[PDB]
Symmetry: D6
Subunit: 99 residues, 12 copies
């Protein structure tokens, strides 16, 4: 299951990115990551094609935000299982209860 990420500078924009992503295709927002310098990432999981659709929409929508800025984005089609155990890209408890 692919992973999609949009990193913005600013919180409002990251929230819009996430909203646009889950609305554009069949992906689950699994988390959000702060790393400082105003950089925040929203992470979604789903089929590669769903994730591609969601990230493209997420980027477009975030850039429309008043003062919105997208810093980086990336999609990994088949993330190695090891990552699930170290980085915050896994379906969380709260998350799978929403499903």
């Amino acid at each position: 299951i692919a992973v999609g990420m949009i990193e913005t500078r600013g919180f409002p924009a990251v929230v819009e990115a996430a909203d646009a992503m889950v609305k554009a295709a069949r992906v689950t927002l699994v988390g959000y990551e702060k790393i400082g310098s105003g950089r925040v990432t929203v992470i979604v999981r789903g089929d590669v094609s769903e994730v591609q659709a969601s990230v493209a929409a997420g980027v477009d929508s975030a850039k429309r935000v008043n003062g919105g800025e997208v810093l980086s984005t990336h999609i990994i089609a088949r993330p190695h299982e090891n990552l699930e155990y170290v980085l915050p890209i896994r379906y969380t408890e709260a998350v799978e209860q929403f499903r």
Copy 2:
């Protein structure tokens, strides 16, 4: 229920943004978010039209603050339910006890 966000650089300004928002219309301040680089966001919930009124007032009032600066703002009319589970835009425990 819509979500409204004002991100400022500086705490005093974000506090004013929040005060102005809840006073301008029928919205509930549900939280506050720090992301570093002096960037803080206040988040309100309510009817889209209430939120529109509150954000416009929040922006005007924050800009009047001595040294106040607004970095970004955004309103999402119908935030996807998935967001409530990942991002800090949900009515909190403390919050719904105030209601």
Copy 3:
């Protein structure tokens, strides 16, 4: 009860701001807030006129600090009750035991 805020860049200056505020008038320092980028805020509560007196003194005294810098300030005469529940402007446990 009004809320007064002085945000400085630097800790020594914020400590002086707070000392000057509680000494200048009848206000209670209720808290302190860090938001990154060296930005820290001290928050006091009291009658609007007391708070006005305290913030003016706090600003003057903070600017006298060696390397002191004031970034922003603001006073809200009647902060909405909703804020008390979300933002760190409320009388705390430790605080009301000092009173």
Copy 4:
């Protein structure tokens, strides 16, 4: 057992770095480290030659990321045991359960 590190500015890029590293050779991603200013490090362990292979791939892949930036990298062939006890380069609980 060698330690390999790639530090990026941006989260998406660090996630790609990690994915590329564990896919390129026989290394275990043991952790991730945030230090502010958007600087994040992913850490892998394995035979020196595996780690060399993984870091080279991790760097190439991270630089291909949209808005990806690599700040620093380093490999230590035989890290002193003392480090395992202070710095986050050790196999963690969650990690060795994945193995």
Copy 5:
């Protein structure tokens, strides 16, 4: 009892500031404060004249540090009791056990 503060950019320098302060006069280092942007403060308590001696020595010694930088300093002769309850300038548990 007076409070003395030296804020540096850099940790090594703040550690030297503290060492120099407690060695120069009869003051107790009561704490250390991080506020981001590399800004850290060391706080001492003691008689105003002891604190004056310690801060002057602390500044001189910190500036001798390789890459040492002092950002701000301040002394408050009779800090208001209210501050003890909000800001980290109080004798701590660990601290008074050293005494």
Copy 6:
């Protein structure tokens, strides 16, 4: 017992600094400190002459790191006991179990 400190900008470099320090002479790495703005410090303890040897090696090795940068360094020959109680320069639990 002397204290030695190397502060870098970047995590990989600080890890190398630490490795080089404990390998160059008879010192114990006792901790690591993050203060933001990418500034991290590694702290060692040992005889002044051991610490001098370790810091010199730590600096040389950190500067060889790809993208490595050393911001500041310092050695305190006889750190005042008060510091042990406030600043993170003390032998920790985990640490003395390694010994």
Copy 7:
């Protein structure tokens, strides 16, 4: 009015059955679960007075049928004073709210 209903059991299995029988028998929300020792645990439900009475009755009959089941005490409070919400686990949690 919105009553609170409580069933206390000796043993966890029996208390889980009480809870399941309570929310199934009537229009009530399980809001809490309280451990106090001696194998005594309480499930707390909220709802209309008549709904809570229906559910507590169902809860008790079912719990007593559990193998090694044992009900210690029960009680229904019709109009719980607001003060209680703030001290005891009878209040709704945002957790059980989202649901």
Copy 8:
């Protein structure tokens, strides 16, 4: 003077009834709830001496009527020494203050 009133029960339901009966019978504030094992739990109220006496009496009569209810001990302290506030859960909390 401002007395403290305590009812200790065996069982949680009975202690919740004690609390509800206490704050309802007189001008007192429930400030705490204390678990100590063996199924023993205490509700603590604050108020004038005469108010606390009225409420403790109501509390006990009501608690004994709870199904499987059982009161273990009670006590009213008329002028609790200030020292106690700082060690025991008899003090008001900002939680119960806001209310």
Copy 9:
């Protein structure tokens, strides 16, 4: 439907045997372990109703064979109400999910 199965024992060793026998005897997942005092502990499993019945039966037979083993109570809930998931440790955890 997806039932929940619970075995409560007196003693930890016996409860660990119950759990091991349960997941081995049928298609069930151990999702929780609950301590409530008096030496009473519960293991909770999730699975189809028929699978959970098979496993609880195996669990009980095995637990009673443990040296100093002792089963206090057991229960199977066929269709646990969703409300319970949110209050009690019967829900899957991302921990047991990854597995």
Copy 10:
């Protein structure tokens, strides 16, 4: 010398009365309160040996008068070894220090 005095009760109300009677009967400071199960709780006071003896005696007489009161054990240590301070809740806390 500075002795430590302890009264252990069965029940919380009685232990709160012990504490109140102790600090009122003599020049002692309540520094701790210890829960260990089976409804056993201890109040610990510090002071001169003769002061602690006066207070423990008062404490016991008063505690035994509490409704459902019960004193389990008491003890006075005249010169408690410094080692104990560091392991047990007999030491002053900055909490009780500020007072």
Copy 11:
């Protein structure tokens, strides 16, 4: 196969002796220690089945010789299901791994 061995005692001293006797009598690793109330505590060891049997036997003989020693229950599981690792303290910890 890698079995798990458990000795549960009444009393801590006896459980510490059990653990010491177990790891000394055979090739096993103490991985956990479990408190569940009523003075019942368990030590858990991991190792080959034959090694764990040797150690549990040694553990029990030694524990029964402890003054006021008392063994409540014991059990050896030869092939503990992987599910258990994720719910119970039978798994290795990085703590006991480093050793």
Copy 12:
């Protein structure tokens, strides 16, 4: 060799006396204090075997003289396996180290 000595009491006051008598009677360090329920608590000391024997003996005689004192179990382990240090509170803490 460096033995561990343990005295377990019923009641806290008696356990505090045991500890005080132990460190006073011989060259031992109190390193821990363990609560396990049923009013059972253990004090743990470290030292030479002969020193620990002297202290445990003193500890027991003194504890039995405590009003309402009661010793449940004791034990001395001459050469505690290193594995134990990592699982149980018999290890020195940096807390008791600094002293």
